[PDB]
């Protein structure tokens, strides 16, 4: 348990230091492109692109703070991050969903409604992401659980093209034990919470698989 | 004919000084966003918006050079220009169509293929505009005819909200005679060319009516 306590603490901290809590942010809104859905708003997409890029870097930073991650080859580290980064982005933004206003909040406090999220870059996947956000709510996840779930999604020994898939599996094992024990201790009354949480990775993958294939437009650059 | 000759001269000149000939321009291309059709490319949309705005200003300038236009009330001038500007933009870009490459050329020389024109801002109207461009070719229009046609489209006494529609009708009359005589003298062997040219204004209207109601995205300044 002490080795498990240490791991949970390290993973909670890794998540917290790379992802502000909604309560820690100064939420601000905008009236820009709120009237109707359009294929893209250029102002919102510029901001969304900027913020997403930063969150990718923060997710990289998060990975480096996970015990053992940097002992993998650089190739394997890039391979793992390429495969899971969008899945982590989706989970991250969905943890900043506010059900009463139907908004998501970015790490600078930018708070956008469903139509604005559509126009910022969610596009045809808007309702799918928002359904997922709403489905997270009953889980009542805390930072340690969000961080552990992120870590489990990332440190996956079944990714294509791993040089040392055995070593990746080895790193994942304690994360699974860590989440299982933590979830059990936190809510002894709700025994299926652990598998329910784990299965959310499948839902992230349904979305990210569609998202990854999208041809996007950027400044050149 | 002396007064008709001088009207044709004034209108040809008005067109030429506000719209460079394809042969007067340095054509240049880009590989940007040529691979497939997308909803919007932000770089091409930026350039397209910039060039379109400039061409609107040039079309206002064109109008001011038309005999009698500035004698109308400022209200009527704006009313006519609001009603016809997009129609004139469509005609203008279609006169810079190069069938062998399936390209259109803007007033700085920028030369984009069909897919690039789609991604620059034509969007779902791309094939409609290109069909119109192709249907222009058999007409073999020169500067005088393009300018007179633009002028007839603009100076229309049946636009709703005109303060002095009679005065507008008065200004249109000589432009119609001017085109009729000019087309007849230019190609006496082809007597339906005059009405065929006039009816292109209807085709312009089919496109502009759809285009005008499109919700576009712009930067917040």
């Amino acid at each position: 348990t002490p080795e498990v306590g240490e791991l949970i603490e390290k993973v909670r901290k890794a998540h917290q230091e790379t992802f502000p809590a909604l309560c820690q942010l100064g939420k601000y809104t905008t009236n820009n492109s709120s009237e109707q859905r359009v294929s893209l708003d250029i102002d919102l997409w510029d901001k969304f692109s900027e913020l997403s890029t930063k969150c990718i870097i923060k997710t990289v930073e998060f990975a480096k703070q996970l015990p053992g991650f940097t002992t993998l080859t650089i190739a394997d580290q890039i391979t793992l991050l390429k495969a899971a980064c969008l899945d982590i982005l989706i989970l991250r933004i969905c943890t900043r969903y506010t059900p009463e206003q139907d908004t998501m909040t970015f790490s600078d406090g930018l708070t956008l409604n469903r139509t604005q999220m559509h126009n910022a870059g969610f596009g045809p996947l808007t309702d799918l992401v928002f359904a997922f956000a709403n489905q997270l709510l009953p889980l009542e996840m805390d930072d340690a659980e969000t961080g552990l779930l992120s870590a489990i999604c990332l440190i996956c020994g079944d990714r294509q093209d791993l040089e040392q898939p055995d070593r990746v599996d080895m790193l994942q094992e304690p994360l699974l034990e860590a989440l299982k024990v933590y979830v059990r201790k936190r809510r002894p009354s709700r025994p299926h919470m652990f598998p329910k949480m784990l299965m959310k990775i499948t839902d992230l993958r349904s979305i990210s698989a569609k998202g990854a294939e999208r041809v996007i437009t950027l400044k050149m650059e | 004919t002396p007064e008709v000759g001088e009207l044709i001269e004034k209108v040809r000149k008005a067109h030429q000084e506000t719209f460079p000939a394809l042969c007067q321009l340095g054509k240049y291309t880009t590989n940007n966003s040529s691979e497939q059709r997308v909803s919007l490319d932000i770089d091409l949309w930026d350039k397209f918006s910039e060039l379109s705005t400039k061409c609107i200003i040039k079309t206002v300038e064109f109008a001011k050079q038309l005999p009698g236009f500035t004698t109308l009330t400022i209200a009527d001038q704006i009313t006519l220009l609001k009603a016809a500007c997009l129609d004139i933009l469509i005609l203008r870009i279609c006169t810079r169509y190069t069938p062998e490459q399936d390209t259109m050329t803007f007033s700085d020389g920028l030369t984009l293929n069909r897919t690039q024109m789609h991604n620059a801002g034509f969007g779902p109207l791309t094939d409609l505009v290109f069909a119109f461009a192709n249907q222009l070719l058999p007409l073999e229009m020169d500067d005088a005819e393009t300018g007179l046609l633009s002028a007839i489209c603009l100076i229309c006494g049946d636009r709703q909200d005109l303060e002095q529609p009679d005065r507008v009708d008065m200004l249109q009359e000589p432009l119609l005679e001017a085109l009729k005589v000019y087309v007849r003298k230019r190609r006496p062997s082809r007597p339906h060319m005059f009405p065929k040219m006039l009816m292109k204004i209807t085709d312009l209207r089919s496109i502009s009516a759809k285009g005008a109601e499109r919700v576009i995205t712009l930067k917040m300044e």
């Binding site: 870097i57 990289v60 050149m220 | 966003s33 997308v38 770089d43």
Partner: peptide, 19 residues
Amino acid sequence: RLITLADHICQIITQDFAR
């Protein structure tokens, strides 16, 4: 310019590991 999201993500991550 056009790019798939997957290729853009890969680019951001690869450049971040550059030394």
